[PDB]
Amino acid sequence: GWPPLVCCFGAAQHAFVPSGRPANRLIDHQIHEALKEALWAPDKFIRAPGGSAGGVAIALASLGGRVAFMGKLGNDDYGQTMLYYLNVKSVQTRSVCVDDKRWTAMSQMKIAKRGALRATTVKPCAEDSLSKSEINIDVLKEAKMFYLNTSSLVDANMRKTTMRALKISKKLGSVIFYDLNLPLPLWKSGEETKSLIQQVWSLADVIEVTKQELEFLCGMNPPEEFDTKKNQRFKFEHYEADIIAPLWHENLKVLFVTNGTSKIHYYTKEHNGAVLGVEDAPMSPFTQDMSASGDGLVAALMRMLAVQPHLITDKEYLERSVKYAINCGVIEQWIVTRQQGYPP
Amino acid sequence: STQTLQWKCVESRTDSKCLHYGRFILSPLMKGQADTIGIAMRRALLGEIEGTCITRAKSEKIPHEYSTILGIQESVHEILMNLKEIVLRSNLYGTCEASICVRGPRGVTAQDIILPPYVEIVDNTQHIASLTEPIDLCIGLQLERNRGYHIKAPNNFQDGSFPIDALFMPVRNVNHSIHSYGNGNEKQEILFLEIWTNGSLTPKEALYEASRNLIDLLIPFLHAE
Amino acid sequence: STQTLQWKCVESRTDSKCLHYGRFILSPLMKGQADTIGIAMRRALLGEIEGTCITRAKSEKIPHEYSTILGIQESVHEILMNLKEIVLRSNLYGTCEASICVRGPRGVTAQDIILPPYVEIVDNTQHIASLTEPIDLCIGLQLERNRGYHIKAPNNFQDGSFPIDALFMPVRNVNHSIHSYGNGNEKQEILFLEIWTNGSLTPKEALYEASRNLIDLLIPFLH
Amino acid sequence: TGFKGFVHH
Amino acid sequence: KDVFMEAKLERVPFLEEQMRKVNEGGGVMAGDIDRLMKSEDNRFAFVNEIAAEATAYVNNNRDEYGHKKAIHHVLSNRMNDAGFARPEAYLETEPFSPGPTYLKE
Amino acid sequence: AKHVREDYLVKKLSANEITELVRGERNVPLIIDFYATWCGPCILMAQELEMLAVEYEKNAMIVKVDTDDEYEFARDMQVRGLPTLYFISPDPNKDAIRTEGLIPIQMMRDILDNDM
Amino acid sequence: PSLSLHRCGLPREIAIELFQTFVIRGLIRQHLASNIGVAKRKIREKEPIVWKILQEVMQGHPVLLNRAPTLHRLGIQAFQPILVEGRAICLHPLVCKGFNADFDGDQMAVHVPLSLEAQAEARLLMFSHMNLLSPAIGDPISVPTQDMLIGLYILTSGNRRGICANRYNPWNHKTYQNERIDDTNYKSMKEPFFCNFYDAIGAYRQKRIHLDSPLWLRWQLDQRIIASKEAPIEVHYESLGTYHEIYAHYLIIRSVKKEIIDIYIRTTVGHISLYREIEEAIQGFYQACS
Amino acid sequence: VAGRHGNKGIISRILLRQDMPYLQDGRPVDMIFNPLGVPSRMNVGQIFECSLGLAGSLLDRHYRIAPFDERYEQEASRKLVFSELYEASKQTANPWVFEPEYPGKSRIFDGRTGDPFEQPVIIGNPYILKLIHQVDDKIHGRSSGHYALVTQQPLRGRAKQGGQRVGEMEVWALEGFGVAHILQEMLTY
Amino acid sequence: VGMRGLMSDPQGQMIDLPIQSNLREGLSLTEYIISCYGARKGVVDTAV
Amino acid sequence: RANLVFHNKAIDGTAMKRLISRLIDHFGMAYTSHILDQLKTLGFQQ
């Protein structure tokens, strides 16, 4: 297995959409049929609902290559079917050290409130147990990349799991692949994920922030575009070096700003550069969920990094793969079934 | 390394209410791409976009199509022919109903139509009927959204329900050109597009729908089997 | 409404090591869709796929193409002709280097081409030259990978390299046909695609690649 | 074909 | 010794599409009729024999013909005794037809 | 109404209703949910929710509530993701099994009938 | 033009009034109808299953097409009808001169042989694939006429031979890349050196070359192009055995040891296309008929 | 459909607008004729009209030309047509109307490939008529029906639901082919 | 292209006036009328 | 690979008639019928 692989922390499951907060418009709770009318009225956080950390594997492995998952499963009825599906798919689970006391597929959410329903975790899912000791030895030994749907950051100890893996990141040579795509609580504000998580927000390498997760995650209002407003170009941002200057970090090769399948910036030690993109899924409105942007986009950069491992800080080597990723991500969005909707 | 693909609109004239024109440009396209894009876009624009129109007209106290009415200068067949050119807008698949109930010596135009909530007319002066004497004129109409030219049977007689073989043509004309860029050794080319629509849609929207219908069509192959 | 779009293959036969034949059927298509789809997909299939092939050859101690050397039954022009139809599978960008440095009065095949791991030979029975003298030969190849309709000008005349200007075809012939059926009120239609291929590409990967490379061009109209 | 005619044994 | 052994024997490729248009155009039957008539001296006698054999076929197993075109049946029977697979009665199918009728150009 | 009424058993308790659900005495497992407007895969969850809500006659009360409608209801349950179900036998001051992910409706029969 | 040589096209209105009784068979036997009156009633209402029968009893039943002003023996010919949509009979263009029929408005009468013997006669004696020669002197009766003839002539028209291809004389002692050594710029556009036919067709599909643009094609067969007493214009001979011969339209590189395989033909893609068409037609008919 | 210069025709196919050749302004062609018909019947007068029609359609003017205009000048019709074409190409900037290398012709494109036909094609706006000999007045079909009182044959034509007649030359053809059953059953059965 | 000259009077014999103009250039009134002599004996032949 | 002649001139009207006669005598009236169908299609295309 020569290809630097991508460890996959967070949790282990399928079909887990992240951030939830007010979209462009609302939809009704009367007769639904296909209630996903917000495949064309979301707010870019759901204008690209991706997939989990193990579903990304199928997106790349379809073309071919070597991708795997690290973490644990439940054990019981939900946990053993976890073993069926994650082994029906194309990922690795040979490094499992499950617990045997919680309930699988159930976070369990008793109470911790002064009233009604303000409640927090108790003993989470039987698969959500990764700690400083439950850490796998392998992780960053046959790998140089690492995906994180940052759901591991609402969890207090899933953090220290990965930062004790920073010493696993530097025991051998490796790098992290944080595809941020922040779920609901990390999608909150600037100070929320600048200091409260501290470590993931500034220690990463081939990272994947999004402009929205730099928009509220920095200048809440003044940095509205920088070029746009001239002929007919959508107001995304002109986010570049001076707008990552708050939050860059070192010991990397090249990081990637995602912003969904929209404007993407790459970051080298010689040259920044900038690319663009779009959000798109109307073709037949009854055949879509605008799904697996996190899957399709991320896999594409991984694919090119594998076939041509001489990427490095090359203008054209990365700029195409970004453009390839931009076209890859939108394609997987509007496919009927994700299972067939993984690039082949 | 050299330039990035750019496309823009360079001209847009509104010749009339129901006639719009738009020219577009693409930028550094390498060889072979321009011809494929141009021919695919022309075919899609000519035969993929859908536009709603009136399909069946029902009249009261009229024997047949080729009949005359007192107080009206226009024969019934003339009224059907004039009614086929009314242009409408909608975005929901399905037939709807409409009516027109007007008094006598007025002069009836396209603004006298009564429409469902999601359907609107674009021109508001298209002549549809001329009236001279006071007679109460009531006509019912059916609206449909299909693709391409469709021909219907004369069934569903009632007193009279004349079906007009409405043409579902929102794009009046399409043209394109593939120029040269002179990029030294590398051979690039500049592609110009040109779309004339009838006001049901507009350029940069007919182009959008035409691109999306094509990317519909090309899609099954991406899935395995 | 019913029977959403899909594609299905009935005939898929590999005749030889460098021959590949496939035929594909589409789903219920409305009137007029089949023609446009067939034309667009044929135009994409003919040339859109990048093809990896040699472009140059550096022969040592040969000043002109009509300078056949003793011990080789094929003239220098024939050496280039043989090193024109070799089939390579790759995902390269740009170029690389290669060499042929052997000395044996015997046959030479494609295995003699020293290649980086990302370029792989498709056949092993292809012939290059016919050595019959204990002489040393050196031909420094130069691979390349362009698109379908790529036009390249001769260059690099300093070192005596001989251009081997090639086709960059993974495909060899495309044939599209349509069928139509009428149930009395519906003109359901069907598409048939027939694809030949060189061998460095399974003629089902062509279906995916020639559609992705067309969707990539059609997408920026939504930007 | 009206020249001779068939017999079939 | 004669160096034309394989230059005259190299298989012509791309023939798969020039294998089908023969089969719906009636080319196989036309090219089989002449091969059956390649040894006959008088064609009228051959035609009369075929007609009599078809009449016998209709008489013995009446309640099958009307679709099978017993003349095609006897032609296929005669062509099937020396190889030449020739499916029964030269019957044509519609492998891809979720519909009742082809447009036929 | 009368003979053709509102065809929805799940009324998606959002007000004091759902608040007093964790503040009540019962004898059978209940379910509530936190979904959104777009609702990702949680509608695929909501398909199986309303089906079993109807299926279980008087015992199980399987309901839901929207998050982005009132952002409080988003953070109120430490809701980090979309699938936010709750196998809840009465827990006025105790724990419950918060079901998440995406689960086929036949398996969710077994667990609720083999455990809880 | 899409019809095969052994096929014609009948309108849906004509066919139902000629094969009516065979359709009555198809309805009664298949137990989709009970009585003669019931079957005829089903026929008269244009039921969608009627055409399935009148697409099923016509396959293999020949029909005699007859041109109303009959002139010669080939004025009446048998054909295998197929159902077409419209009101006109589609006829093959090659047999038109056999019928002496134009398309400015003409009428053709159809007849149906009922007897099994008559069907055998029509199929085995009056089909336009065993009547390809006229009885006058024995000359072909179905040959490519005006439009096909023009297409084939344009295909096999060649390049521009002499002063119509070059403005200036090619003697013109210049452009030699002249110096004391042969180490200069080497473009030598010359003409393409395609391996075989299919390489030439492929390169033509990319629009790299035009139809009449000349090219060199290697020959791996015997001599086929019609030559004559002729003369080789210029045969170069190196100090070592090379035998570089240049004829009027082909080049031969022999030697003093062995392997006279360097035969190269100057040609255009049109001639290659025609030869490939004929060759693959033969090799496809041979293998289709086993 | 027939023209005014003896160029008759039978409609063979009807194509969708996206499947027909278009000029260099994108307008689809409305009718396609066969060029070979001009050298045979030797009616060049249509071509002039063709070209002239184009000019009218691009200038909102109608021409009423008396015959034999070659009395004022030599090749006066050529001057008229070419001057009108140039004026139409200059007043409305359509440089394809009068190409000053093959006047009256232009290079049209292919409606199903987006390729230009290799040679320039003559285009125009001629006046085409529709003739009374319609196909629905010429179809026929008869399995059985009325027979004549005496001869006991199908009556005649289409009004009486008759059958097509075979006689003389037709029989001579059937005897030539050596088909006896076919000829027999067209006289007895 | 060329000349249509020397049409024939119906009762044999040639006509003195020669048709010295093409069909591209256009016949004159007298030349066109002369060409009608051979036009009539083209339809009194197809009917005979 | 068949037994044919590689034409390198203009196949005019009288050359087409000669070619059909030679293909008939060398192959028969069953092989020629398929050639004529192919030449008709290729002639109409060009």
Catalytic residue among F21, F31, F32, F39: F39
Distance CA F34, CA F71 (A): 11
Q: Do chains E and G touch (3 or more CB pairs under 8 A)?
A: yes
Confirm if A142 and A95 have CB atoms less than 8 A apart: no
Which residue among G74, G87, G147 sits closest to H136, beta carbon to beta carbon? G87
Opening angle at CA H113, ends J40 and G282, nearest 5: 30
Q: Which residue out of C25, C202, C221 would a mutagenesis test of the B interface target, given it has the greatest number of B Cβ atoms within 10 Å?
A: C221
- Give the strands of the sheet with C20-25, arranged side by side: C8-13, C20-25, C187-197, C171-182
Residue written as token pair 């009065």:
C105
Which residue among E27, E47, E54 sits closest to G285, beta carbon to beta carbon? E27
DSSP string, H69-136: -TTTSSSHHHHHHHHHHHHHHHHTT-TTSS-TTSTTEE--B-TTT--B-SS-EE------B--S--GG
Is H42 touching I (CB cutoff 8 A)? yes
Residue type, G122: A
Residue written as token pair 């000359």:
G139
Q: Is the backbone of residue B135 left (phi > 0), alpha (psi -120 to 50) or beta?
A: beta
Confirm if A81 and A105 have CB atoms less than 8 A apart: no
Q: Which of E23, E96, E15, B213 is nearest to C25 (CA)?
A: E96
Residue written as token pair 């192919």:
J38
Confirm if F37 and F66 have CB atoms less than 8 A apart: yes
Q: Give Cα C113 distance to the centre of its chain.
A: 18
Resolution (A): 3.2
Tell me whether residues A287 and C4 touch, CB distance under 8 A.
Answer: yes
Distance CA A306, CA A329 (A): 18
Q: How many helices (H) and strands (E) does chain C have?
A: 3, 12
Give the number of other CB atoms < 10 A from CB of residue H144. 10
Give the number of other CB atoms < 10 A from CB of residue E1. 3
Distance CA B156, CA B59 (A): 13
Tell me the residue length of chain B: 225
Query: Cα–Cα distances in Å, from J42 out to A18, A126, B112, C139?
Result: 60, 71, 58, 43
Opening angle at CA I5, ends I3 and I9, nearest 5: 155
Is H74 touching I (CB cutoff 8 A)? yes
Q: Which of G52, G44, G47, G48 is nearest to G17 (CA)?
A: G44
Tell me whether residues G125 and H142 touch, CB distance under 8 A.
Answer: no
Tell me whether residues E44 and D3 touch, CB distance under 8 A.
Answer: yes
Question: Six-digit token pair at C211?
Answer: 């559609």
Which residues in chain H have their CB less than 8 angstroms from residue C39's CB? 112-113
Residue F39 appears among annotated catalytic residues: yes
Query: Cα–Cα distances in Å, from C86 out to A283, C110, F32?
Result: 42, 8, 66
Tell me whether residues C32 and H112 touch, CB distance under 8 A.
Answer: no
Distance CA A210, CA A297 (A): 13
Q: Could you give the count of Cα atoms lying within 13 Å of F96 in the half-sphere of its Cβ? A: 29
Question: Six-digit token pair at I15?
Answer: 């006509």
- Strand partners of residue C174: C195
DSSP 8-state class, residue F88: B
Query: Which other chains touch chain D, taking contact as 3+ CB pairs less than 8 Å apart?
Result: E, G, H
Confirm if G81 and G15 have CB atoms less than 8 A apart: yes
State which residue of chain E sits closest to J30, comparing Cα positions.
E31
Residue written as token pair 């190299």:
E10
Opening angle at CA H91, ends H88 and H93, nearest 5: 90
- Strand partners of residue B142: B56, B97
Which residues in chain E have their CB less than 8 angstroms from residue D4's CB? 45
Residue type, C22: G
Confirm if J42 and G155 have CB atoms less than 8 A apart: yes
Residue G212 distance to chain J (closest CA, Å): 12
DSSP 8-state class, residue H10: -
Distance CA G193, CA G215 (A): 6
Q: What letters, b where the CB count within 10 A reaches 16 and e where it falls short, cover H9-47?
A: beeeeeebbbbbbbbbebebeeeeeeeebbeeeebbbbb
Question: Six-digit token pair at G24?
Answer: 């009555």
Q: Which of G71, G134, G115, G98 is nearest to G8 (CA)?
A: G98
Q: Could you give the count of Cα atoms lying within 13 Å of A116 in the half-sphere of its Cβ? A: 13
Tell me the residue length of chain F: 116
Interface of C with A (CB under 8 A): 4, 91-93, 118, 208, 212, 215-216, 219-220, 222-223
Question: Six-digit token pair at F20?
Answer: 């007093």
Confirm if A241 and A269 have CB atoms less than 8 A apart: no
Distance CA F18, CA E105 (A): 67
Question: Six-digit token pair at J39?
Answer: 């030449």
Confirm if F48 and F105 have CB atoms less than 8 A apart: yes
φ, ψ dihedrals at G176, nearest 5°:
-75, -5
Question: Six-digit token pair at G62?
Answer: 């020949």
Tell me whether residues B215 and A283 touch, CB distance under 8 A.
Answer: yes
Confirm if A142 and A1 have CB atoms less than 8 A apart: yes
* Burial of residue F92, with CB atoms counted within 10 A of its CB: 0-12 exposed, 13-18 middle, 19 or more buried: exposed
**Chain C to chain E Cβ contacts (< 8 Å):** 37
Q: Give Cα A179 distance to the centre of its chain.
A: 3
What kind and span of H or E run contains C121? Answer: strand C119-121
Confirm if C92 and C119 have CB atoms less than 8 A apart: yes
Tell me whether residues A316 and B219 touch, CB distance under 8 A.
Answer: no
DSSP 8-state class, residue H65: P
* Burial of residue G186, with CB atoms counted within 10 A of its CB: 0-12 exposed, 13-18 middle, 19 or more buried: middle
Q: What letters, b where the CB count within 10 A reaches 16 and e where it falls short, cover E17-43?
A: bbeebbeebbbbbbbbbbebeeeeeee
Query: Cα–Cα distances in Å, from G142 out to E27, G274, J21, J33?
Result: 17, 19, 11, 9
Residue G103 distance to chain E (closest CA, Å): 19
Residue F45 appears among annotated catalytic residues: no
First to last CA, chain J: 25
Residue type, F49: L
Confirm if B73 and B130 have CB atoms less than 8 A apart: yes
Tell me whether residues A282 and B212 touch, CB distance under 8 A.
Answer: yes
Which residues in chain H have their CB less than 8 angstroms from residue C32's CB? 16, 18
Q: What sign for the dihedral angle of Cα H113, H116, H122, H126?
A: positive
Which residues of G line the annotated binding site?
A: 102, 104, 106
Q: What sign for the dihedral angle of Cα G190, G196, G197, G198?
A: negative
Distance CA C165, CA C151 (A): 10
- What experimental approach yielded this model? cryo-EM
3-class DSSP state for residue A79? Answer: helix
Q: Which of B165, G43, G105, G101 is nearest to H137 (CA)?
A: G105
Q: Which of I7, I17, I11, I15 is nearest to I39 (CA)?
A: I7
Confirm if G288 and E23 have CB atoms less than 8 A apart: yes
Residue H184 distance to chain B (closest CA, Å): 46
Q: What letters, b where the CB count within 10 A reaches 16 and e where it falls short, cover C140-164?
A: bbbbbbbbbbbeeeeeeeeebbbbb
Residue type, G183: D
Confirm if A141 and A172 have CB atoms less than 8 A apart: yes
State which residue of chain B sits closest to A233, comparing Cα positions.
B8
Which residue among G142, G152, G265 sits closest to J11, beta carbon to beta carbon? G152
Dihedral angle of Cα B81, B85, B90, B95, to the nearest 10 degrees: 10
Catalytic residue among F30, F42, F53, F65: F42
Is B132 touching H (CB cutoff 8 A)? no
Q: Which residue out of F48, F76, F80, F93 would a mutagenesis test of the A interface target, given it has the greatest number of A Cβ atoms within 10 Å?
A: F80
Confirm if E57 and E70 have CB atoms less than 8 A apart: yes
Distance CA C90, CA C171 (A): 15
Distance CA G10, CA G19 (A): 11
3-class DSSP state for residue G21? Answer: helix
Distance CA B63, CA G202 (A): 65
What kind and span of H or E run contains A333? Answer: helix A315-333
DSSP 8-state class, residue H64: -
Interface of H with B in 94-133 (CB under 8 A): 113-115
What kind and span of H or E run contains E29? Answer: helix E27-36
Q: Give Cα A162 distance to the centre of its chain.
A: 15
Q: Which residue out of B3, B9, B212 would a mutagenesis test of the A interface target, given it has the greatest number of A Cβ atoms within 10 Å?
A: B212
First to last CA, chain B: 38
Opening angle at CA B219, ends B214 and B221, nearest 5: 135
Is C148 touching G (CB cutoff 8 A)? yes
The 3-state secondary structure of G107-152, one letter per residue? CEEEECCCCHHHHHHHHHHCECCCCCECCCCCCECCCCCHHHHHHH
Which residues in chain J have their CB less than 8 angstroms from residue G142's CB? 36
Question: Six-digit token pair at H64?
Answer: 């009423």
Confirm if B98 and B114 have CB atoms less than 8 A apart: yes
- Strand partners of residue C58: C140
Interface of C with B in 17-76 (CB under 8 A): 24, 26-27, 29-33, 35-37, 39-41, 43-44, 47-48
Q: Which of E12, E23, E9, E43 is nearest to E85 (CA)?
A: E23
Confirm if A225 and A262 have CB atoms less than 8 A apart: no
Distance CA B195, CA B45 (A): 8
Residue H82, C-beta contacts closer than 8 angstroms, at least 6 positions apart: H98, H103, H104
Tell me whether residues I29 and H75 touch, CB distance under 8 A.
Answer: no
Confirm if A290 and A49 have CB atoms less than 8 A apart: yes
Residue B22 distance to chain A (closest CA, Å): 15
Q: Which of A197, A315, A325, A305 is nearest to A259 (CA)?
A: A325
Characterize the bridge pairing of strands G193-194 and G215-218: parallel
Tell me whether residues D6 and E44 touch, CB distance under 8 A.
Answer: no
Opening angle at CA B150, ends B146 and B153, nearest 5: 120
Distance CA G205, CA G255 (A): 36
Confirm if G31 and E53 have CB atoms less than 8 A apart: no
Residue written as token pair 């695609």:
C193
What kind and span of H or E run contains A277? Answer: none
* Burial of residue G199, with CB atoms counted within 10 A of its CB: 0-12 exposed, 13-18 middle, 19 or more buried: buried
